[PDB]
Design an enzyme around this catalytic site. Structure first.
Site, mmCIF file in Angstrom:
data_model
loop_
_atom_site.group_PDB
_atom_site.id
_atom_site.type_symbol
_atom_site.label_atom_id
_atom_site.label_comp_id
_atom_site.label_asym_id
_atom_site.label_seq_id
_atom_site.Cartn_x
_atom_site.Cartn_y
_atom_site.Cartn_z
ATOM 1 N N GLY A 1 -33.480 6.941 -29.136
ATOM 2 C CA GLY A 1 -33.682 7.055 -27.702
ATOM 3 C C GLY A 1 -32.829 8.182 -27.125
ATOM 4 C CG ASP A 2 -32.572 11.767 -23.815
ATOM 5 O OD1 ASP A 2 -33.294 12.650 -23.241
ATOM 6 O OD2 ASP A 2 -31.293 11.892 -23.963
ATOM 7 C CB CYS A 3 -27.826 9.769 -23.995
ATOM 8 S SG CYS A 3 -27.725 10.483 -25.655
ATOM 9 C CB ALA B 1 -34.085 6.715 -23.089
#
Ligand SMILES: *[C@@H]1O[C@H](CO)[C@@H](O[C@@H]2O[C@H](CO)[C@@H](O[C@@H]3O[C@H](CO[C@H]4O[C@H](CO[C@H]5O[C@H](CO)[C@@H](O)[C@H](O)[C@@H]5O[C@H]5O[C@H](CO)[C@@H](O)[C@H](O)[C@@H]5O)[C@@H](O)[C@H](O[C@H]5O[C@H](CO)[C@@H](O)[C@H](O)[C@@H]5O[C@H]5O[C@H](CO)[C@@H](O)[C@H](O)[C@@H]5O)[C@@H]4O)[C@@H](O)[C@H](O[C@H]4O[C@H](CO)[C@@H](O)[C@H](O)[C@@H]4O[C@H]4O[C@H](CO)[C@@H](O)[C@H](O)[C@@H]4O)[C@@H]3O)[C@H](O)[C@H]2NC(C)=O)[C@H](O)[C@H]1NC(C)=O
Ligand SMILES: *[C@@H]1O[C@H](CO)[C@@H](O[C@@H]2O[C@H](CO)[C@@H](O[C@@H]3O[C@H](CO[C@H]4O[C@H](CO[C@H]5O[C@H](CO)[C@@H](O)[C@H](O)[C@@H]5O[C@H]5O[C@H](CO)[C@@H](O)[C@H](O)[C@@H]5O)[C@@H](O)[C@H](O[C@H]5O[C@H](CO)[C@@H](O)[C@H](O)[C@@H]5O[C@H]5O[C@H](CO)[C@@H](O)[C@H](O)[C@@H]5O)[C@@H]4O)[C@@H](O)[C@H](O[C@H]4O[C@H](CO)[C@@H](O)[C@H](O)[C@@H]4O)[C@@H]3O)[C@H](O)[C@H]2NC(C)=O)[C@H](O)[C@H]1NC(C)=O
Ligand SMILES: *[C@@H]1O[C@H](CO)[C@@H](O[C@@H]2O[C@H](CO)[C@@H](O)[C@H](O)[C@H]2NC(C)=O)[C@H](O)[C@H]1NC(C)=O
Ligand SMILES: *[C@@H]1O[C@H](CO)[C@@H](O[C@@H]2O[C@H](CO)[C@@H](O)[C@H](O)[C@H]2NC(C)=O)[C@H](O)[C@H]1NC(C)=O
Ligand SMILES: *[C@@H]1O[C@H](CO)[C@@H](O)[C@H](O)[C@H]1NC(C)=O
Ligand SMILES: *[C@@H]1O[C@H](CO)[C@@H](O)[C@H](O)[C@H]1NC(C)=O
Ligand SMILES: *[C@@H]1O[C@H](CO)[C@@H](O)[C@H](O)[C@H]1NC(C)=O
Ligand SMILES: *[C@@H]1O[C@H](CO)[C@@H](O)[C@H](O)[C@H]1NC(C)=O
Ligand SMILES: *[C@@H]1O[C@H](CO)[C@@H](O)[C@H](O)[C@H]1NC(C)=O
Ligand SMILES: *[C@@H]1O[C@H](CO)[C@@H](O)[C@H](O)[C@H]1NC(C)=O
Ligand SMILES: *[C@@H]1O[C@H](CO)[C@@H](O)[C@H](O)[C@H]1NC(C)=O
Ligand SMILES: *[C@@H]1O[C@H](CO)[C@@H](O)[C@H](O)[C@H]1NC(C)=O
Ligand SMILES: *[C@@H]1O[C@H](CO)[C@@H](O)[C@H](O)[C@H]1NC(C)=O
Ligand SMILES: *[C@@H]1O[C@H](CO)[C@@H](O)[C@H](O)[C@H]1NC(C)=O
Ligand SMILES: *[C@@H]1O[C@H](CO)[C@@H](O)[C@H](O)[C@H]1NC(C)=O
Ligand SMILES: *[C@@H]1O[C@H](CO)[C@@H](O)[C@H](O)[C@H]1NC(C)=O
Ligand SMILES: *[C@@H]1O[C@H](CO)[C@@H](O)[C@H](O)[C@H]1NC(C)=O
Ligand SMILES: *[C@@H]1O[C@H](CO)[C@@H](O)[C@H](O)[C@H]1NC(C)=O
Ligand SMILES: *[C@@H]1O[C@H](CO)[C@@H](O)[C@H](O)[C@H]1NC(C)=O
Ligand SMILES: *[C@@H]1O[C@H](CO)[C@@H](O)[C@H](O)[C@H]1NC(C)=O
Ligand SMILES: [K+]
Ligand SMILES: [K+]
Ligand SMILES: [K+]
Ligand SMILES: [K+]
EC number: 3.2.1.37
Lengths: 770, 769
Positions: B288-290, B292
């Site tokens: 995941g993005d940070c 997300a």
């Protein structure tokens, strides 16, 4: 497809396959030393199987590719790639090799049918039979007489007693059937994901396939309604084990639909479950059953023509067609923008990934290329076919009569199953080296034999009765051999009742009036209602002999004389006749439903009274069974799942507890001992099953007075139930483990804490999408 | 998550991450010689990576497992398994290693931003930069100062000109961005599915992610509506190439939702597309993005709470959380029967399968363990950061003022981008060995320099104008350095217009009235509307200098003095200002829509008039271009797809035809030459694209009178269009291939036969279920 007049495949259960599909091929191997592929990547042993197979397929024309998308792969002459036949069989012996008339390669070992093999309750036996079958298959391959993949094993369960192919299965229980699959598959393949595949195995038939034709309901057009709960708890576990644990390299998708969708066009079955949930090998391929892609169109009507059926099956994940749909219609599909070329290549790449891993491209010194006819002779000479029949014969009823007293000098051998040949072999068999009938077994025994046919299998004539009564009155004991065979139960031919055929029971009745010891052999895969024999005190003994294979007659005679002792148990329920009349055999619902007149199906759910239970079998000795710890105490669900699981891919594969007992031979004769371990519980939601199998074992050679310890590991996953969504769930509450149907030893345990999911069951978003 | 008062993440575009997420870790390697793992299967070099990783994870307690589900993996002290940080960065140089204050490991090479690297149209350059970044990452790893995976490259496209992170991208074109991705990923990983991974790359951000904050539309809450046709044709190809062709080992799922579903909880994106369609590595892992995963709950509301967000993201196929959602909420999800333990293990097994393939368990003699600070010094000393800036600077306007004639002895160097430090580096950068401003480049040129600030970047003050007008009157020539920087365009900060900031254009205007040669540098990633400069005959030259990295001032001065010659081209459209006012930047529809006021987006669809076009760039010489065969004739779609395809995994990867031309330097200076080859057609469904890129190249060192052959393979897949369902389809009809925006060489071809599908696009049955 190849029918010569109008054929309604909603009723007809035999497909009409084209001759290309049915053609045997002369097998050979590619030449990676000097042939056209020798300086190409498929012949580079430093690359992965997938990279080698992808490189081979990139060399084809589209026309060449399409000719290798069916079971009868025509090869590619330009590249020196041989024709290759995917349609091999090894249900209980080599079944579909290119047998010659006489001399070398004119026969192979014919083991008992799987229903008899499983009744031995000996997982090592299933494994050893698979290793011999695997060796014999490789002998035929090295002779140019077969391929290196087979459409075996059958790991459907014998859910309904009428099924014409129940004889091919390990019975009605998913735990036994799972273990059978695991042992047979790992034996065929030469290990667990081994360095070199020995024989590519195929788990079939996936899924919901357990009816041929009952009351005109053809398998080819059946649309079986199955809850996600029952699909997950019963209809799929053998396939989960085959895929996740045995690491099977092929699955065969079934003829039928489930919940609206033919298996071979079933994106939920092939992609969402098998590949995304059950850890199917990344290189594994799905074969359609033979004609199943065609049936997606005719008669399912899921696709509107055979080109659309082919495209829908390829895009769902059917890699190879057993049939001529892909070969003859995939070009039309491509030209009508239903599939890409890469879609058609995907399945052929998967097939050849497995052939690469079996050493097909690696030349004459690769593993298993040195197996000869002499290895067929030396494995057959072990007489494991005889051993399997001896272990899998079941004693249902006995007074003092078996084994026969030394006072018995002559036997009258009577009935339709006495003088037989290929009846011993069931179905899916090749030529055997010999076939020993029950008559021949008794002739070889050194008893005086008096043979009378008495009656044919399905006869309403008493013409042969007098000759049989005459033989019986002059003998010291009577052996009646009867039951069912493949004239009653076969592929495309379910039974319409579960009673003894013809007038066999009438002749047994007359034979019981003569004041002589009377032994009845109930032969066949399915059970028949033997309540009249159970109730007749003058029927002294009753044996279920299944389909006992090439040495069957010697095994039956040796048990009856006490040269050997029985310890097999039934692996299906012998239901009363009315079970087959009171609700439709196409009802897949296992749980009892009073409203629909379903009394519950299998030993797990049936609320009626079997004639003989699943797991019933008698011995020639008596056993005393006891345990040190009747209360194994409490286990916390969260604790068991949250500690390490060294040596297991998954936490739920660990042992929860060992079921342990002392088994003492307290009788007059040495005997083996068979054990089924059942769990029962009120944990989780109602309704509750009566019990379910969590383990089994066979102990060997207990002499009178000796004791042996039974130790059966009960895994965490074996005691999980299944929720309404299909999740496999461990539920808190009280459990009992019991030894055998009589519950000779009971071990209590408690699960504490919160419910936990051990398998997440994915949502089927594809089957009803608009 | 870690906000101290109510924060509306539908508007705020910066997540508030917990310190555990943000903590750098001291790196080390497990000891397979003498540690607790030495007698266990993870240290058995005869087993597969997957089997070794499965065996490792089977040793853990559940509490140990959960502590290793986030980017800041705490390790397992019992087993001697070190903590491991998944959050590394290498956008254009080592960016998130544990840099020390001074001496060894206090810096890494800072290349130009991707947007400038791509403008070189040199695929070999992108690869070589990746190989140097990979080598420098390994040096930091061996020093215990970093991990062996990075969240790079960014292969989103710069679809809308306001985007604050378009600077990080290879521009608005999917073909160029796909090639950038392939070259940078294969360089990072050390080959195409190599025996030993060098650095695990992460294609980001998958998918539909190209807005930060415009008109308060935060990326954290954005739900982008994309047709299956445009998702397939434009928003996914760079990811298809990264997955299928570059064999990338990681993908990062984006903050936003598409068609109702957050990317990290998007089963269609992660399973049906990436894994089942795009041939993602069987061992690959999704990060995941940070924050997300947290956003799946707050603010998307796709899940009701953070445990349900965690469970939905795990089940969709998000393997590792950049954040603390998995670490702090996985146990709650398990105890509430939302996930099994095996579900949680699946993602950590995938991560460790990649770490095993990178030699993480194989000891000090494994590949790449011999890379030292010596290798940072020696690779930096190649001066590729300078070369990249020289090749990616774009000449937009020129009347022979450039290169400066020998009669010019003095320059007035004016404007906010003249005297700069970290402005040169764009974003996602680590400390540089040095930073050369435009001012220092001119001071080093041996021209006499008169510096005046003139104005700040965003100024409403004329207080510096008089001093700049004075320096300009005193000199032979005027260099104005201006544009935008990360005070205008950044992560969590889209532009609200696409005009020059403050009063910079007012000061240029005044400087253009002094009868001196005037050169304007338009710096930054996004384009600004330079129409006033295009139209002013007294603006003699205009350069787009992007973010030119550590040696940027030397590259600019060497171009301007003619020590080097420019050949870069724009990789985004410079739109007129009103483009950013007439339709919402959150409209993802590429095709023009007269009803909605959408004029069409990117060079492929835009029905307006760019100030400077995509692919525009000028040279210090003249070229003559021609070809022998202007009509390449007909190809049958069935024939082309039905012959063999030796050396290609897929038929459509084959070359259909080569675009070839003779290119002659007809002028008076040695120059490189850059080419874009565009296709256009009336085949397939209306509406028809204006054109699209099918190939590019850069020829080197054409001396005056020299001729070279341009040869650009046009693959079958490159000319395929996309149907209404998302299938990639080859259509019969008339095509033209054209060299550059002026179509200097045109090659016609016809496809005959029936339509053919070359990529079957699966139905999305999960997003609305
Ligand atoms: C549950 O089912 C189990 C599995 O079926 C039952 O166990 C089986 O019992 C059978 C009946 O007793 C045994 O059959 C007799 O075997 C002997 C030959 O034995 C040797 O070879 C066996 C096969 O070896 C191959 O396969 C195994 C297993 O897969 C491999 O591990 C081997 O490497 C080898 O592999 C090759 O072939 C396979 C297949 O093609 C390929 O895959 C491979 O790549 C290889 O090419 C082997 O199993 C035997 O091993 C046992 O004995 C060893 C010591 O000799 C010992 O070290 C081993 O540990 C193993 O020990 C265990 O088992 C023995 C088994 O009895 C125990 O005593 C012991 O204490 C341990 O528990 C062995 O290496 C064969 O000669 C017999 O045939 C003669 O006698 C029969 C009687 O029925 C006659 O009918 C025949 O006609 C024949 O007569 C000839 O010879 C006579 C005597 O010399 C002579 O009198 C005659 O004139 C005539 O010439 C039987 O075939 C079978 O071995 C055994 N299988 C296994 C796996 O244990 C189990 O009993 C059952 N029940 C219970 C309660 O568990
Ligand atoms: C498009 O973009 C291209 C890529 O950037 C441009 O090509 C580059 O041009 C620059 C500028 O001229 C040139 O830079 C010089 O390089 C000199 C050293 O050259 C040798 O080594 C390099 C690097 O080798 C490592 O990397 C490559 C992979 O990138 C790898 O294959 C090697 O094995 C080696 O790997 C090691 O390091 C990597 C990274 O850490 C690890 O991954 C790996 O494990 C190893 O540890 C090579 O690329 C050179 O190769 C060239 O020369 C050999 C024969 O000599 C050829 O066989 C090969 O094809 C190639 O030829 C091309 O470039 C040369 C010029 O080098 C031309 O003559 C030829 O015609 C071709 O164009 C060498 O082996 C270095 O000494 C030099 O530094 C000095 O000058 C600068 C100022 O210029 C000073 O500041 C310095 O202090 C020095 O005094 C300078 O750095 C690159 O070598 C070149 N790169 C490549 C890949 O070709 C291209 O110009 C551009 N434009 C166009 C129009 O195409
Ligand atoms: C498992 O099934 C057995 C057999 O039906 C149940 O046996 C009863 O147990 C209680 C003690 O709790 C006794 O008072 C009865 O005598 C038992 N009946 C028989 C037939 O033995 C048992 O309750 C079931 N256990 C669970 C946990 O479901
Ligand atoms: C490809 O695009 C070019 C534009 O670059 C089209 O050429 C134009 O064609 C129309 C005819 O409809 C003329 O009115 C214009 O003068 C042409 N413009 C130029 C600049 O040459 C061309 O027709 C397109 N071709 C295809 C096959 O779509
Ligand atoms: C075969 O049966 C099908 C229906 O199953 C029918 O449509 C077809 O006409 C038949 N073929 C022939 C040659 O009779
Ligand atoms: C395809 O197989 C047929 C026979 O069923 C054969 O006649 C034909 O030549 C094959 N095509 C190619 C291209 O080999
Ligand atoms: C028949 O098989 C035996 C044993 O493998 C072998 O010795 C003999 O050569 C075979 N006969 C022929 C004709 O190959
Ligand atoms: C047994 O059946 C065979 C056919 O397999 C028949 O030829 C034979 O006559 C029968 N034997 C007796 C004793 O009737
Ligand atoms: C049994 O069936 C055979 C084969 O049809 C027939 O010849 C024979 O007459 C039958 N015998 C009896 C006793 O019915
Ligand atoms: C039980 O059978 C009735 C009658 O068919 C049916 O309406 C009901 O749905 C069934 N119950 C279950 C649990 O399937
Ligand atoms: C079960 O018994 C086996 C065989 O003795 C033993 O190795 C294992 O540790 C036991 N497991 C438990 C949970 O007691
Ligand atoms: C953080 O913001 C959320 C809304 O995004 C709010 O629910 C929460 O109370 C805030 N935390 C604190 C400590 O103010
Ligand atoms: C890293 O190592 C340094 C130097 O020993 C130490 O101060 C620091 O606490 C360590 N840990 C982290 C988590 O940075
Ligand atoms: C998990 O990580 C925390 C720090 O965030 C640490 O205190 C705790 O000990 C770890 N748990 C285990 C079981 O190692
Ligand atoms: C720093 O790097 C140099 C290599 O250039 C090396 O000789 C030196 O020992 C290193 N310094 C330290 C203090 O490790
Ligand atoms: C340039 O900026 C630096 C850093 O802000 C400043 O210290 C320096 O004085 C400036 N140089 C000139 C010539 O104004
Ligand atoms: C530019 O900005 C700096 C820093 O805010 C300020 O000190 C300076 O006075 C400004 N100069 C001009 C000419 O506006
Ligand atoms: C242009 O947009 C920026 C934000 O990108 C803003 O600061 C500035 O005020 C805008 N200019 C005008 C004249 O509105
Ligand atoms: C054009 O925009 C209008 C207004 O939003 C919309 O209703 C219409 O569907 C759009 N047309 C297309 C082809 O998307
Ligand atoms: C196209 O150009 C490449 C690069 O020179 C060459 O290898 C290839 O053979 C050419 N193909 C054709 C069709 O000319
Ligand atoms: K009943
Ligand atoms: K400044
Ligand atoms: K506009
Ligand atoms: K070829």
């Amino acid at each position: 497809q190849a029918n010569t007049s109008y054929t309604d495949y909603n009723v007809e259960a035999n497909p009409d396959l084209f001759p290309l599909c049915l053609q045997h091929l002369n097998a050979s191997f590619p030449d990676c030393a000097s042939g056209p592929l020798s300086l190409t990547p498929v012949c580079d042993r430093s690359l992965s199987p997938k990279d080698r197979a992808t490189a081979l397929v990139s060399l084809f024309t589209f026309d060449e590719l399409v000719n290798n998308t069916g079971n009868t792969g025509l090869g590619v002459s330009r590249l020196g790639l041989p024709n290759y036949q995917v349609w091999g069989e090894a249900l209980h012996g080599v079944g579909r090799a290119n047998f010659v008339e006489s001399g070398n390669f004119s026969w192979a070992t014919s083991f008992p049918m799987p229903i008899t093999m499983m009744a031995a309750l000996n997982k090592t036996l299933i494994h050893q039979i698979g290793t011999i079958v695997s060796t014999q298959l490789r002998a035929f391959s090295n002779a140019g007489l077969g391929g290196v993949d087979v459409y075996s094993p059958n790991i459907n369960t014998f859910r309904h007693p009428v099924w014409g192919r129940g004889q091919e299965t390990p019975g009605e229980d998913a735990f036994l059937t799972s273990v059978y699959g695991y042992e047979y598959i790992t034996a065929l393949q030469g290990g667990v994901d081994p360095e070199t595949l020995k024989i590519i195995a195929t788990a079939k038939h996936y899924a919901g396939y357990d009816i041929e034709s009952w009351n005109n309901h053809s398998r080819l057009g059946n649309d079986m309604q199955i809850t996600q709960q029952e699909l997950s708890e019963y209809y799929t576990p053998p396939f989960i084990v085959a895929s996740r644990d045995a690491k099977v390299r092929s699955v065969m998708c079934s003829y039928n639909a489930v919940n609206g969708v033919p298996s071979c066009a079933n994106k939920f079955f092939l992609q969402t479950l098998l590949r995304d949930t059950f850890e199917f090998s990344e290189d594994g391929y799905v074969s359609g059953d033979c004609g199943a892609v065609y049936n997606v169109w005719n008669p399912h009507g899921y696709a509107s023509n055979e080109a659309a059926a082919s495209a829908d099956s390829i895009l769902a994940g059917t890699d190879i067609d057993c049939g001529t749909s892909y070969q003859w219609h995939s070009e039309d599909a491509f030209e009508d923008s239903l599939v890409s070329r890469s879609d058609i290549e995907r399945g052929v790449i998967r097939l050849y990934s497995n052939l690469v891993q079996a050493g097909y491209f690696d030349g004459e010194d690769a593993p298993y290329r040195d197996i000869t006819w002499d290895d067929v002779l030396s494995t057959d000479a072990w007489n494991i076919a005889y051993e399997a029949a001896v272990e899998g014969i079941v004693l249902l009823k006995n007074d003092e009569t078996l084994p026969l007293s030394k006072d018995i000098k002559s036997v009258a051998v009577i009935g339709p199953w006495a003088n037989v040949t290929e009846e011993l072999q069931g179905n899916y068999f090749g030529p055997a080296p010999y076939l020993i009938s029950p008559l021949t077994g008794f002739r070889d025994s050194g008893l005086d034999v008096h043979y009378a046919l008495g009656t044919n299998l399905t006869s309403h004539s008493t013409s042969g009765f007098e000759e049989a009564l005459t033989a019986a009155k002059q003998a010291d004991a009577i052996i009646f051999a009867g039951g069912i065979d493949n004239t009653i139960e076969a592929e495309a031919m379910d039974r319409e009742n579960i009673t003894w055929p013809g007038n066999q029971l009438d002749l047994i009745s007359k034979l019981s009036e003569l004041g002589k010891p009377l032994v009845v052999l109930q032969m066949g895969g399915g059970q028949v209602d033997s309540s009249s024999l159970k109730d007749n005190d003058n029927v002294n003994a009753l044996i279920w002999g299944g389909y006992p294979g090439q040495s069957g007659g010697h095994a039956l005679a040796d048990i009856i004389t006490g040269k050997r002792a029985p310890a097999g148990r039934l692996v299906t329920t012998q239901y009363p006749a009315e079970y087959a009349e009171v609700f439709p055999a196409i009802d897949m619902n296992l749980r009892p439903n009073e409203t629909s007149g379903n009394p519950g199906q299998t030993y797990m759910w049936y609320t009626g009274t079997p004639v003989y239970e699943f797991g019933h079998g008698l011995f020639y000795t008596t056993f005393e069974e006891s345990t040190e710890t009747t209360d194994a105490g409490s286990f916390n669900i969260q604790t068991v799942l949250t500690t390490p699981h060294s040596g297991y891919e998954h936490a739920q594969q660990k042992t929860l507890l060992n079921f342990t007992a002392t088994v003492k031979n307290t009788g007059e004769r040495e005997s083996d001992y068979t054990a089924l371990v059942y769990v029962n519980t009120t944990a989780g939601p109602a309704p509750y099953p009566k019990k379910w199998v969590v383990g089994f074992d066979r102990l060997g050679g207990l002499e009178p007075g000796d004791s042996q310890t039974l130790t059966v590991p009960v895994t965490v996953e074996s005691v999980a139930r299944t929720d309404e969504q299909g999740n496999r769930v461990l539920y808190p509450g009280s459990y009992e483990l019991a030894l055998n149907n009589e519950r000779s030893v009971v071990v209590k345990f408690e699960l504490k804490g919160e419910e936990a999911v051990i398998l997440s069951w994915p949502e089927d978003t594809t089957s009803d999408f608009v």
